[PDB]
């Protein structure tokens, strides 16, 4: 069920290093469109994604490929691109943490 334990451990190391980057702050938790008075968020963003959801899918063995993790990350960034604009501060921070995460994933050991 899910990626093998060594792949999962590498991915969790990656996530935990990323969470500690200041650029991660806006993605630590799910966006709360009501707390933030942005009602149009769930109309534009059909699939919200955040670092907490990713981590908890990881622990649940809900990821079958490292590419799924990367895709959820990408989606996390494309959401802010779509709702705040391509050059908003939050979007650039998303891009920065996405770069850091891919960099970490480069060293992802193989299934075998
Ligand atoms: C008026 C406005 C419009 C969009 C957004 C917004 N868009 N995307 C995301 C991922 C996001 N995350 C919440 C967050 C940002 C900073 C911290 C500490 O939490 N907020 C915030 C305010
Ligand atoms: K904006």
Author numbering: 126 to 237
Give passages from the manuscript.
Surprisingly, unlike 24 and the other analogs, methylfuryl‐containing compounds 24c and d significantly inhibited CgBD2 in the HTRF assay and inhibited the growth of C. glabrata strains expressing WT Bdf1 and the Bdf1‐Δbd1 mutant. Of the two compounds, 24c exhibited the more potent BD inhibition (IC50 values of 8 and 12 µm against CgBD1 and CgBD2, respectively) and antifungal activity against the WT strain (EC50 value of 90 µM), while displaying only modest cytotoxicity toward HeLa and IMR90 (primary fibroblast) cells at the highest concentration tested (300 µM) in an MTT colorimetric assay. The crystal structure of CgBD1 bound to 24c revealed that the methyltriazine moiety forms direct and water‐mediated H bonds with BC loop residue Asn209 and ZA loop residue Tyr166, respectively. The p‐methylphenyl moiety is recognized by hydrophobic residues Leu161, Ile163, Phe208 and Ile215, including a close contact between the p‐methyl group of 24c and the Ile163 methyl group. Shifting the compound's methyl group to a meta position would abolish this contact and (in one of the two meta positions) yield a steric clash with Phe208, explaining the loss of potency for compounds with this configuration. The methlyfuryl ring packs against Pro151 in the RPF shelf, while the methyl group makes a van der Waals contact with Arg150. Considerable space surrounds this moiety in the binding pocket, explaining why its replacement by certain bulkier substituents is well tolerated. Superimposing the structures of 24 and 24a onto that of 24c reveals that the thiophenyl, furyl and methylfuryl groups of these compounds would all clash with the Tyr327 gauche‐ conformation but that only the methylfuryl group would form a favorable contact with the trans conformation, explaining why compounds 24c and 24d, but not the other analogs, inhibit CgBD2. Namely, whereas CgBD residues Arg150 and Tyr327 point away from the binding pocket, the corresponding Brd4 Trp81 and Typ374 side chains point into the pocket and would clash with the compound's methylfuryl group. In summary, the identification of 24c demonstrates the feasibility of developing inhibitors that target both CgBDs with selectivity over the human BET BDs.
The fungal Bromodomain and Extra‐Terminal (BET) protein Bdf1 is a potential antifungal target against invasive fungal infections. One attractive target is the fungal BET protein Bdf1, a global transcriptional regulator. BET proteins bind chromatin through their two bromodomains (BDs), BD1 and BD2, which specifically recognize histones acetylated on lysines. We show that Bdf1 is essential in C. glabrata, and that inactivation of both Bdf1 BDs induces lethality.
